[PDB]
Design a protein around this ligand. Sequence first.
Ligand SMILES: COc1ccccc1NC(C)(C)C(=O)O
Lengths: 257, 300
Amino acid sequence: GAMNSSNYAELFNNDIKLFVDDTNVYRVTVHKTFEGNVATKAINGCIFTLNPKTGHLFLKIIHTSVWAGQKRLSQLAKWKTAEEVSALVRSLPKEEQPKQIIVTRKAMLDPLEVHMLDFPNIAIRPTELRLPFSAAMSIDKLSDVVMKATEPQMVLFNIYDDWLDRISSYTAFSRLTLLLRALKTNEESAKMILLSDPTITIKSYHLWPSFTDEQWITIESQMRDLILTEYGRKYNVNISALTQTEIKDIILGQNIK
Amino acid sequence: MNTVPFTSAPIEVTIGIDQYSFNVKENQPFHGIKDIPIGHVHVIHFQHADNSSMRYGYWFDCRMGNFYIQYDPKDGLYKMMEERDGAKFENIVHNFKERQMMVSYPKIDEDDTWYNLTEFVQMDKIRKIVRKDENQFSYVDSSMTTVQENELSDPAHSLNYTVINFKSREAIRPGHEMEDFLDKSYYLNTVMLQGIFKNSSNYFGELQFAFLNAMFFGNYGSSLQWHAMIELICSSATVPKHMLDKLDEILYYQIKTLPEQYSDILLNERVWNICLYSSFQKNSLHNTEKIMENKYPELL
Ligand SMILES: COc1ccccc1NC(C)(C)C(=O)O
């Protein structure tokens, strides 16, 4: 069935599973035409397919040429996503294929189920958590590869860099979603936090800076304060007055659809 | 005109004959139904007065044999049987007619209702949905499940309607996933009509039979099948014009006949609003749309 907070540890068990987020597949800018009408211009997009246990990210780049001459693009985008996820699964060795695919948006359920009819043992599930995977394009190295692509392309990343050498996948996923929620909430301030200190750098083969265990604790705290600050800014709430239990409660509520 | 005599009526029962119905009292002198119009299938059905559980009945065609009803006190129900001795049967009927022990099938001469509900239903096709080949007639009841229901438990007592499932490999060509899911014309025209049913008359027959089993027995799997067969047509962009015109007529007479008080359990709100207002054929069912809106505007 659906995936939420009660069965959350299931994400980090030994059954292969993938999250699929389609929010950046079909990306447009809206602008006025010379005649004063409105028109869209698409830009390259991507399918975000993530193994939460391993950190393996299958980033399928969606080149704008795929929309050429097509109608009802927002609907096509879901079916194109399902087609590409299905093709990914078929490309993987049997012992690497997922047992479950969790979609971040309920509108992907029927497109993926129909594309995966040949895999009746793969469960297709929605999720009540508010996952911030749309902010993937806020990670500079991912945004760069998407915008530079001149053709469809699949790129493989480890979105946890080397963190699993030091922490569990439960903690690594929590870190990830906290970083991505901060980037979607206040991208400028989030990136400022991540790069302020020049002496900590991003390895050529990594997406995020090379923080020590202690520095990650500091970064994580700054990210939570960033999100809490925005919460205060958004709803005109005095966050200084809030108790720790209230703050924990506000976070749990804000992380559910 | 033909006759279905009754040996007797030992238990109080509401008897149905097609869309008509009458009450018989415990051990009342009732010996059957006469003047049954030749040319149509018929259904004689029962609901016991002391136990409304199990509506049940028999589909039959008087051209295929001489049938009568006899109560079975061991199995506790009225059973249809065939009489092979022709001279015995005629003499039994004539005696009961002389003694006026039979109700007359009450067909108003203006009334094409039963024809309109059974235009495409043939006994031979009923006998393939209801498999009991030693009898020329077919028993159906309230609780019989359909093959599709069983897949989702006794197979000999099941309704073998054609399985319709929009998210199955039968409905969806590999490589045409979006196309076939949003436009069911492949599944309708190639799989179902050309492949399984061979023509639209057989398709409509099964549709009509499903409705009548839903209405007369409260059979839930039949109601599912009826709605599935409607939706399959309405959700197809490409339907022969004559099938759409005939579907409109078929549904009109079904909606016209449905008891008003059973609308909440016999009509699926999602399916009908989808078929009338969002589907490809949303504007192809003028007569059905007009009677539905004037008779069941709540459902919409
Ligand atoms: C602590 O607040 C939150 C905690 C987690 C996620 C979000 C929020 N709040 C904002 C960023 C305003 C939101 O978008 O809902």
